[PDB]
Design a protein around this ligand. Sequence first.
Ligand SMILES: *[C@@H]1O[C@H](CO[C@@H]2O[C@@H](C)[C@@H](O)[C@@H](O)[C@@H]2O)[C@@H](O[C@@H]2O[C@H](CO)[C@@H](O[C@@H]3O[C@H](CO[C@H]4O[C@H](CO)[C@@H](O)[C@H](O)[C@@H]4O)[C@@H](O)[C@H](O)[C@@H]3O)[C@H](O)[C@H]2NC(C)=O)[C@H](O)[C@H]1NC(C)=O
Ligand SMILES: *[C@@H]1O[C@H](CO[C@@H]2O[C@@H](C)[C@@H](O)[C@@H](O)[C@@H]2O)[C@@H](O[C@@H]2O[C@H](CO)[C@@H](O[C@@H]3O[C@H](CO[C@H]4O[C@H](CO)[C@@H](O)[C@H](O)[C@@H]4O)[C@@H](O)[C@H](O)[C@@H]3O)[C@H](O)[C@H]2NC(C)=O)[C@H](O)[C@H]1NC(C)=O
Ligand SMILES: *[C@@H]1O[C@H](CO)[C@@H](O[C@@H]2O[C@H](CO)[C@@H](O)[C@H](O)[C@H]2NC(C)=O)[C@H](O)[C@H]1NC(C)=O
Ligand SMILES: *[C@H]1O[C@H](CO)[C@@H](O)[C@H](O)[C@@H]1O
Ligand SMILES: *[C@H]1O[C@H](CO)[C@@H](O)[C@H](O)[C@@H]1O
Ligand SMILES: *[C@H]1O[C@H](CO)[C@@H](O)[C@H](O)[C@@H]1O
Ligand SMILES: [Ca+2]
Ligand SMILES: [Ca+2]
Ligand SMILES: [Ca+2]
Ligand SMILES: [Ca+2]
Ligand SMILES: [Ca+2]
Ligand SMILES: [Ca+2]
Ligand SMILES: [Ca+2]
Ligand SMILES: [Ca+2]
Ligand SMILES: [Ca+2]
Ligand SMILES: [Ca+2]
Ligand SMILES: [Ca+2]
Ligand SMILES: [Ca+2]
Ligand SMILES: [Ca+2]
Ligand SMILES: [Ca+2]
Ligand SMILES: [Ca+2]
Ligand SMILES: [Ca+2]
Ligand SMILES: [Ca+2]
Ligand SMILES: [Ca+2]
Lengths: 411, 414
Amino acid sequence: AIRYSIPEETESGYLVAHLAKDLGFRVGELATRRARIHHRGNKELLQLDVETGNLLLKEKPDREALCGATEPCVLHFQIILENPVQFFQTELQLTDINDHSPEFPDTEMLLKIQESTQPATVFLLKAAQDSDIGSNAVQNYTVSPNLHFHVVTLSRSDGRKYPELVLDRALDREEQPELTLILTALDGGAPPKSGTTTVRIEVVDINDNAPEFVQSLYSVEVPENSPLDALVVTVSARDLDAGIHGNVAYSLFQGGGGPQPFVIDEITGEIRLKGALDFEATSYYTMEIVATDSGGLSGKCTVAIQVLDVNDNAPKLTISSLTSSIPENAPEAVVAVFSVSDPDSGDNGRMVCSIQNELPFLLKPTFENYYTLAAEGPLDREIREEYNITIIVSDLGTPRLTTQHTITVQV
Amino acid sequence: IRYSIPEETESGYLVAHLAKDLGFRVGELATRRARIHHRGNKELLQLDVETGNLLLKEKPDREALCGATEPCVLHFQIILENPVQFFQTELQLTDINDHSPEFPDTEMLLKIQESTQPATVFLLKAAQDSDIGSNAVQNYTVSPNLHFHVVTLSRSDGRKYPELVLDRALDREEQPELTLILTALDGGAPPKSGTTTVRIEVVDINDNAPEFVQSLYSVEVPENSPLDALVVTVSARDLDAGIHGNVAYSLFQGGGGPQPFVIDEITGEIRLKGALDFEATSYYTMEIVATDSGGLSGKCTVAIQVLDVNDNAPKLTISSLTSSIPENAPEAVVAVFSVSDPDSGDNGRMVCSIQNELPFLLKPTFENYYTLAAEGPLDREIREEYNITIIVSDLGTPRLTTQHTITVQVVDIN
Ligand SMILES: *[C@@H]1O[C@H](CO[C@@H]2O[C@@H](C)[C@@H](O)[C@@H](O)[C@@H]2O)[C@@H](O[C@@H]2O[C@H](CO)[C@@H](O[C@@H]3O[C@H](CO[C@H]4O[C@H](CO)[C@@H](O)[C@H](O)[C@@H]4O)[C@@H](O)[C@H](O)[C@@H]3O)[C@H](O)[C@H]2NC(C)=O)[C@H](O)[C@H]1NC(C)=O
Ligand SMILES: *[C@@H]1O[C@H](CO[C@@H]2O[C@@H](C)[C@@H](O)[C@@H](O)[C@@H]2O)[C@@H](O[C@@H]2O[C@H](CO)[C@@H](O[C@@H]3O[C@H](CO[C@H]4O[C@H](CO)[C@@H](O)[C@H](O)[C@@H]4O)[C@@H](O)[C@H](O)[C@@H]3O)[C@H](O)[C@H]2NC(C)=O)[C@H](O)[C@H]1NC(C)=O
Ligand SMILES: *[C@@H]1O[C@H](CO)[C@@H](O[C@@H]2O[C@H](CO)[C@@H](O)[C@H](O)[C@H]2NC(C)=O)[C@H](O)[C@H]1NC(C)=O
Ligand SMILES: *[C@H]1O[C@H](CO)[C@@H](O)[C@H](O)[C@@H]1O
Ligand SMILES: *[C@H]1O[C@H](CO)[C@@H](O)[C@H](O)[C@@H]1O
Ligand SMILES: *[C@H]1O[C@H](CO)[C@@H](O)[C@H](O)[C@@H]1O
Ligand SMILES: [Ca+2]
Ligand SMILES: [Ca+2]
Ligand SMILES: [Ca+2]
Ligand SMILES: [Ca+2]
Ligand SMILES: [Ca+2]
Ligand SMILES: [Ca+2]
Ligand SMILES: [Ca+2]
Ligand SMILES: [Ca+2]
Ligand SMILES: [Ca+2]
Ligand SMILES: [Ca+2]
Ligand SMILES: [Ca+2]
Ligand SMILES: [Ca+2]
Ligand SMILES: [Ca+2]
Ligand SMILES: [Ca+2]
Ligand SMILES: [Ca+2]
Ligand SMILES: [Ca+2]
Ligand SMILES: [Ca+2]
Ligand SMILES: [Ca+2]
């Protein structure tokens, strides 16, 4: 019927309006009829000065405590006249004034966002509480300047607006494990009121980096007489990831052809012998060590073992042709034809054989490791009844191995 | 002079005719006491000088006399005594397929994550074969499957190894693990087989966001519920397992106004954090979010409607009052009063009563505004005074009452 508007939190005793003038009767009538104003329920904000016919405040009106969310804030008062009994209805509209700053319930919010999160994905954040409404309510959301994210204020929901976080640039834990941002709520009033809170984003480690080997190739040499438990070479790999995505499993791939006496440890990556070696049998070993991640990522390296020849085999002497007894007057007579063989390699397999120089016999080097023992020129029967001959062959290895065979020739 | 014979040929078999090839008669060989000599190890060959023939003495094993090195050639020197003469002859052993492809491990374990991209290659152990060339491993086949296929790489100095290739993406949610049969095919005729079991274990990754059982929750709670009261329990399920399957629950209240609601991360139980009041807040709307330990999230809406309990009794206020009433006054007004009830529904609807026998009656002027008045002129002599008691009561359950007593003295003008 009759509505007057006044701002919120107006000081007590302030004049609201002229009731007598607007309603259409003299002050004398109000004084005579003992006019009194009554709010129907709670405490009365208004007083009616009947001496002047004016309507003024008694108490400071708080919008957020008398209306709250409901808008517009209108209070209903009934002014009464005694004789005759008469009622007039008057309404008081409280204008909202920005007397509350946006504030966040929690000082800091923790977020866990996995490394493998795709861009344009949206996250929901807690909102700043504001008692005020309309233009005096929360109107904007701004985040501290950063490369990865940006903040968008969504005006959804029945009332007010909430903050949403949007990702534009893909995340990587290897560069930044965690990020820290400053979230600020800006009021719509003039001047705006601030409200800050800390946003803590924790990047979750995922398996996106394959284990890589420190060294691409390993070349190590091992003697053929090494014990069964001997450390050949230890290979290692590093993973950029952490946790179960950072643990590395080592397994070996031997060559397609021929079994190998090598075994590797899953954890340490130590390559040890699983059997005995032999340079004469296998001169070289080539294999590939693979490091598989606990997720599935793998990195491969090549390992080449060159065995070292040890002079473990002594010269072998074999008799091809021999003459049990020798003539007396035979010139350039051939006693025996023998050969030497050495399975070892290098100068360990090169042989030299010797005989007593005092003896009339001499061996002539015929072919490759092929010699013939013979007597040069005629011999005497009376002078020598018999000959015990022992030829001793030795290699040029380290150490030197010797072999001797005894033969007795009767002239 | 080189002669060729297959590996593992039975002892005593004739290798070749030396006399013919070298170019002299058998008699010369017999006369000179011709003897054949292997330079080093045991001798496979024997030279029968009675026929001038060359024959085996022992069964030749390629893999034990040559091994990897090819061609397998043995060097012999044949000797003639008088005069002393040397002729060099060589024996080439042809490899025969007498070894079946075999795998070192009976079964191989692979771990391939669910998020594995197609065309990615994995390395598998190779089947060991003693033979070489065409008699070695020549082909690799895998048991027919939807996801993978096998490719044989001819890398390494010798022979070829098996590689596994992925063509169709993997999902742990459909199939947790796969089992395949790897077979190594020899090149010889007929080919020899060699099988092994391949077990692929798919590793769980975070690719499924937690989803809520019900999109919306409607629950009602009285305004006088204790601080520790179970309002509603919300739950969500995650397809993933392990840490990718664990769910964290947190609530989002409205932008405006604080709420007395608190949520548990684990149980998803929404409980009161304070007291309620229907007169203050009639409705609550919030959003429950389920965040994964990886970062994936699922959202639902929860709306709680509080129920008004008739906890407030009617309030009676006197606006205007007259202590005493004239004698011959017609329709005289004793008082003007009002009633107020903060409750809602029939809990806030009020009815007020007075003794009907009394001449006075209350007239309903406005909404919960009444005026007490006397019906007709009154007489002084009959009644010196009146005890009046107005009783106002709401229509709620239970009914709350409030009463005010006023005593009016009817006085004549004189
Ligand atoms: C290694 O072995 C695999 C499979 O081995 C087979 O299975 C084992 C158990 C043995 O039985 C082997 O004998 C088998 O070969 C080979 O891969 C595939 O082999 C299959 C054989 O069935 C091929 O499928 C066939 O494709 C035919 C179509 O061929 C058309 O094109 C050719 C081109 O030359 C032409 O000649 C022909 O006339 C057709 O026009 C089809 O008709 C037939 O029914 C059958 O389905 C398949 O194509 C082979 N795939 C590949 C990728 O090779 C490998 O070839 C083998 N590798 C070697 C020997 O090196
Ligand atoms: C003015 O009149 C009122 C109303 O009394 C009625 O009207 C008068 C004209 C007569 O006709 C009375 O007979 C009528 O009852 C008087 O109020 C009454 O007071 C008496 C004395 O205390 C009450 O009687 C007692 O009440 C005790 C308490 O009752 C309470 O509980 C009931 C519900 O169970 C509740 O309604 C009431 O308001 C009390 O809260 C009780 O323990 C005791 O046994 C006895 O019954 C009588 O109940 C009152 N009336 C009513 C309607 O309750 C005023 O006293 C009187 N004025 C003066 C100055 O005396
Ligand atoms: C929130 O406040 C900012 C002021 O910091 C408004 O300005 C935006 O950002 C910069 C200011 O540094 C301007 O250069 C841009 O042009 C503004 N962006 C847009 C989209 O206009 C920003 O507009 C405010 N947000 C809202 C929703 O009003
Ligand atoms: C709110 O207040 C802060 C200071 O507390 C300002 O930095 C901001 O711009 C806004 O005015
Ligand atoms: C918001 O940010 C300010 C600094 O800009 C702090 O002082 C305040 O406590 C809140 O964290
Ligand atoms: C060896 O033998 C298997 C059966 O045992 C065959 O499937 C294979 O193709 C090869 O002939
Ligand atoms: Ca205020
Ligand atoms: Ca305000
Ligand atoms: Ca504000
Ligand atoms: Ca990365
Ligand atoms: Ca990794
Ligand atoms: Ca990572
Ligand atoms: Ca050796
Ligand atoms: Ca050696
Ligand atoms: Ca030697
Ligand atoms: Ca063999
Ligand atoms: Ca063979
Ligand atoms: Ca074979
Ligand atoms: Ca999946
Ligand atoms: Ca999940
Ligand atoms: Ca999964
Ligand atoms: Ca209440
Ligand atoms: Ca209530
Ligand atoms: Ca009530």
